[PDB]
Amino acid sequence: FSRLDPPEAEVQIDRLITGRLQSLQTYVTQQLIRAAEIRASANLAATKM
Amino acid sequence: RFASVYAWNRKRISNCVADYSVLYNLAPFFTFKCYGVSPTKLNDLCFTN
Amino acid sequence: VYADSFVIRGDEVRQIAPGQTGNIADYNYKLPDDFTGCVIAWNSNKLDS
């Protein structure tokens, strides 16, 4: 924002906002699959106890 | 005098305070394309070399 | 539809565009950054001179 005028500055930050959202989308999705993997172990642990 | 195309000059400017309004006031300077920084921000940065 | 008519000197005729800086824009007539319209400027040296 310091080096670029207002219109182009958005063009550039669009790449970062979509880029960083893609980083969080991947992070959350990996957590969802891991959470289900832990749950199947928790249900097995509850079954054995 | 300005140099020729095939042997272009290179002057190193350092250790001073940069004001760009003198450029805009004197002569039209029709083409002022900039490739890494917007001209209106040139007054709010600091340059290495 | 609103029409604004005036006469400037031909040196700064291109400072009408929003986002520019200068005496005429900052002190006489400035347009918003989100201007939605058109501008028509011509030379009338045959009449006013």
Curated annotation (Swiss-Prot), chain A:
Q: What is the effect of changing T47I?
A: In strain: Gamma/P.1
- What does the annotation give as the result of altering S2A? In strain: Alpha/B.1.1.7
Q: What does this protein do?
A: Subunit of the fusion protein that is processed upon entry into the host cell. Mediates fusion of the virion and cellular membranes by functioning as a class I viral fusion protein. Contains a viral fusion peptide that is unmasked after S2 cleavage. This cleavage can occur at the cell membrane by host TMPRSS2 or during endocytosis by host CSTL. In either case, this triggers an extensive and irreversible conformational change that leads to fusion of the viral envelope with the cellular cytoplasmic membrane, releasing viral genomic RNA into the host cell cytoplasm.
What is the protein's name according to its record? Spike protein S2'
Source organism per UniProt:
Severe acute respiratory syndrome coronavirus 2 (2019-nCoV)
Q: Provide the taxonomic classification.
A: Viruses, Riboviria, Orthornavirae, Pisuviricota, Pisoniviricetes
Name of encoding gene? S
